[model samples]
Target chain A: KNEPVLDTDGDELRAGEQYYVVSAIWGAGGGGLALGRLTDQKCPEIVVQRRSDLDYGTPVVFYNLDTKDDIVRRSTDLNIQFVPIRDRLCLTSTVWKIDDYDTSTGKWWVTTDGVIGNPSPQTLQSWFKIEKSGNLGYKFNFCPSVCESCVTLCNDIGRYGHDGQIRLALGENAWPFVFKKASSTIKQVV
Target chain B: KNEPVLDTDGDELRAGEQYYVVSAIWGAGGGGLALGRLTDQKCPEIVVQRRSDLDYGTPVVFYNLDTKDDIVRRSTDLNIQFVPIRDRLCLTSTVWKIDDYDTSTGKWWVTTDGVIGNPSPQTLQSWFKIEKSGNLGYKFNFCPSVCESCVTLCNDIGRYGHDGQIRLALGENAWPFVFKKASSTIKQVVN
Candidate 1:
C-alpha cells in the first residue's frame, strides 16, 4: 500500500525528517534503534539496547526528494543519520561466512553499513522499505527495484538473539518498530 | 568548463562506464590507479603502484547519470568499484590522528571510504570531480557543491609518499593522473 508512515504519536512521518525508531514491543527493556561499529567493522553494528538517553537509538531520515518530498511512504528507505552531514542501513560488503559453522547464519550473517542517497543504481544496496506487520506496527524490508542493475534479495529485517547478542539481520521475519519523532520525544526515552 | 571528460584516447568519458586511471607520470614507473585496504583498516589503502593486467588499478564509474548520461563532466563523481556492489572514495568517519607525529600529516591524513549514488543530500559525501592539472593531464578533487545541506570541504586529491608507503591523502599537491579506459587498456600497476 502506498501509505504515509506514521509516528507513535499518530502523526505523519515526513521525508528528510529525523525520528527515533522504538520497538513496538516496548513491553520489556526494548526502546529505540541505534548504529555502532563492531570490534573490527567500519560497517553497521546492531545490538539490543537501554539506560540513559545515551541508550536512546540514533535518529534516522528517509530520503525521498524524488517522487515527493514530504510524507514518507511505505515504499521509501529508512536512512540512518550520519553524525555531521548525512547515509542508510544495509549489510556490509562481507558476511561472516560459515567456514567454521554449519548454518546459513554464517554465510547469511551480513553485518551492516550506512550510506546516503539513492539516486543511482550503485546505491541500491542501501535501498529499503517498510510495511504493516501482523503485530499491527511497521516492519522494514529490502527489495530494491529502482535500478534493474542491482541484485535484489528480498529479506525482512528482524531481530535475532544469537551468540549472546540481540542483533538485526536479513531473514524470514519482520521487526515491527514504531516511530517516535525525536522532537516530540525530547522530553523522552530512558 | 562543461567539456566532456576525455580518456587517453581523447574519447568522451561515459557515465556508468568503467575506466582505468593511469598516472600521466608514465615517465619512469607510475602506471594506473588502483585501490586496496590498509593492513588493519577497511577504509582506504593507497600505495604507489606494476607488472601485469592484475597490477592495473580498479576501474571506476562516474555517477554523473544526474547531469548527463552519455558523457561525464567536470562536476561528476569518480565512483570506485565496490566488488560486493558499487560505491565511492572519501575519508572514513574517523581520521588516523597523529597524536605522536604532531603534523596535519596525521590530522589531515584522511583514509577514504566508499558509498554509492547521489540522489539525496546524505550521499553528498561521495560527490567528487575532475579538473585540468598544471601538468596538462587531469587531477581528481573532492569539493561537493550540489547539496547546500552538505558541509563542503574543498581539497585536491593528491599523493604522499611516507611511512614506507606511497598513499593518497587530502592535501595541497595535486597528483595528476591520466585516464586509460579499462576495456581499451586490458593490459595495465603494482600499488
Candidate 2:
C-alpha cells in the first residue's frame, strides 16, 4: 500500500517544522494536549497547552512545542521509539495497565515490552500509538486491547499534571487527537 | 560597532523558520519566554517556551508561534509595526507605563500617538524602543525617563500576559530576552 496521506489542512507535511497535537473532538481550547515542562524540570509531561505555544512536534522528534528542545526518551531502560506501524502511522514504546480511573494521581502507567528498540529486546512499559482516529484527529492508543472495556488512552477529562506518565482511558472516550503545523510566519527573534 | 553578533548559538537566521525568544539570563525553563496563543484566539500572547526546539523564524509577516496563522494587528486603527530603530534594532507601536511589580495581571499598557502612519501624523501615547539590553537580551524600553526609573524591558520576574499592551519594567529586573536559530534536524514533515 502507499503511504497514508493525512487528512489535514496541508497536503504534504514539512520536516523540521512543528505541529500542534489537538483532540479531534474539540479543535482547540481546553481540548489541546501539549508536551509540557513543569517548573524547573527537564523531562516532559503530557499536560494541557495552557496559554503557551510550547507544545509541538515533528514526525520523529517531538519538541516541547514552544521551546527548541527535543523530547528524549525517559532513559535507555524506558525508551520511547516512534515506529511506523503502517506507512505514516506510528506508535511510541509499548503499553501496560492503569489500575484506577484517576489518571491525574500519577498511578496510570504502561510498559515497553514489545517496543522496537535499537540494541536488544527489553521489557519496559509506556507505549503509545499515533494512528488516525477516523479522519478527524489522531488517537493515542496506549496498551491497546481487543477487550473493549479497558481504559487505555488519554481522554479530554483526564487529569493533566507535570508528572511524566502515560495516562490511559477508553479509546472511544479518549480525546480525538489532531495536529496543526506551526505557522510559517514566526521569524527567529534574534 | 559592527552589527552585534548575538550571543547565541547560530549566526545566519533564515526566513520562514521559527526561533525561541528566550531570556538570556536563564536558558530554557521558567525564564524562557515564548510567543504563546491563549484559548483558541488568533492573537499570539507572550508566554513561556516550556520545552521544545529553540529555532524558527519568518519574515515581516508573523505567524502564531504554534498555530499556522498570521498575527495581524488588532485593527487598522491600532496597528504595530516592526520599525527599524538602528540597523537591526527596532520597536513596536509605542511605549508606556510598566511601574508596578505585578506583570502577570496584564495591567501595564502603551499606545502609539506620534506614529508614522500613511496620511496623518498623530502624536499618540504608545511608543516603545527596541534596543539591545547590555550584551545579553533585547530591551523594550517603555516610556523611558532620563532619571532611569522606568521599566526598560522584559526580565526574569516581570509579569507576562496578553492584554494587547506594551508593558515595561526596570531593564535590570525585567526578563532578559534572547533568541536562537532553528536547528537543521527539522525537515518539513511532508517528505
Candidate 3:
C-alpha cells in the first residue's frame, strides 16, 4: 500500500533529505549595553555561557556514569575556555571591617590593613562591616584581629582619601583645604 | 796628717761622720716678678718639686738611661705608684706670634700661644713676640709656631676671648686720644 504525506494546504509533502536552518539568537534581548558606556558609568559586566558549546561525544552505555558527575567534570573543563571580565573593579570603594566598639567606654577604635585616619563615621555605615567585641574598633584593607597597635596605619585620618576627615583635603583636593577654600570645583571661586 | 774640710765659718771640719745639711732651691730667683696677676684669677695650683725630690740621681743625668733609666723605663709600669702632680715650671705669660702684617695695607694678623687676648694694645705689646711681614702669617706654638687659642682658653673669656680686644669706655671719663684714665690708678670701678 502506498502512503501519501499531505501538507496542511493539500499539497503533497516531499521527503528524502530536506535542508532547514536552525539559528540561535544570542545576547541580552534588549540590545546589549555598550562596553564604553558601561565602563564610564562604573558598572560591572557578568556573562554566562551555554553548556552546548562543548563538543564531547555521547556515551552509548551511559548507565554507569552519573549525570551530575559528568556535568561537574565538563563544567571544570569548560571553565578553562571561559574568561569573565569584571569591569569597574578598580572603581569600587574599599570595604572596611570594624573590629570592635565599647559602648561603656565610648572609645571607638578602628583599624585598616594600611593606615587610614579620621574617616567619617558615616563612611563606616554600609561600606564598613563593624564588630563589637574584644578591643572594640574597625578594620579596612585587611581582615580584622586583635593585635598590637590596633589603630596603627588603619584610620582614614591622616590618610590618602576622605580629605583627612576635614583636617587636610587629600590628593588633588588637598591644596584647597590647606588654604581653606569654598570649593574644589571652581579653582578661583573661593 | 789630712787636710781639714773648712766650713762656712772657715773652721776645721771633723771627719767623724760630719753633719752637713745642703738645701737646694729650684725655680727663678725672687719668683721672677709675680708677672702681673693673670686676668683669669682662677689658676690651678702649681706644686714645685725639684729633681732631687725623687732621690733617683743628679739633676744633669735626671732622665738619663744609666742613672734614672730604671725609674724612666718602669715609670709606666709603676701603675699605682706614679703620682701625677702639676709641677712648677714657672707659669709665665705665653708668647705671641705675629704671622703676617702690612703697615701700608693695615692688614695685620697675629696669634698668641701662651697668653690670651691682649686686653689693651699695651698688654699685647708686653705679651707678644711680634714680627711684621708683607702678606703671609705664620705662628708656631712649640718653640716656633704659637698657640693663640690656648691663650684665649686660659683667660676667663672662655673660648670667645680670641676675638676680644680692649674696649675703651665711652662715657665722659673716656679719653679720645688715650684710652687710659688720667688718674694714676686704672681699674674697673663698679658703681
Best by TM-score: 1
lDDT of 2 at B142: 44
Q: Please give, for residues A1-190, the per-residue lDDT of candidate 2 as tens digits.
A: 2232242574333323444554454323344343333355333222333332333332232322113332212111212322222333223222222222221232332222233322111221233345445656555544422222221233222323334432333323445555565465652432
Q: By lDDT, who's the top model here?
A: 1
Candidate 2 per-residue lDDT over residues B1-191, each given as its tens digit:
11332425544322244444455654332343323333543232222233323332211112211232222111112122222124321132221222222223323322212233221112122233344667666544443222121112222223333444223233324555555543431342226
* Stronger candidate by lDDT (1 vs 3): 1
How would the docking of model 2 be graded? incorrect
> Taking the tens digit of each residue's C-alpha lDDT, what string does model 1 give over A1-190?
3788888878778765677777777656366766544454444454333323334576666766264556777866544442212254344521111011112242123333434564444454456787778656888776666654322345677766555555666656677788877764343211
Name the better of 2 and 3 by TM-score: 2
Could you tell me the TM-score of candidate 1?
0.41
Every candidate's DockQ is: 0.01, 0.01, 0.00
Candidate 3 docking category?
incorrect
Candidate 1's interface RMSD, please? 19.0
**If ranked by lDDT, best first, what sequence of candidates would result?**
1, 2, 3
Give candidate 3's error at residue A44 in angstroms: 14
Give the number of the best model, judged by DockQ.
1
Q: Candidate 3 on A141-161: residue-level lDDT in tens?
A: 221222221111122211121
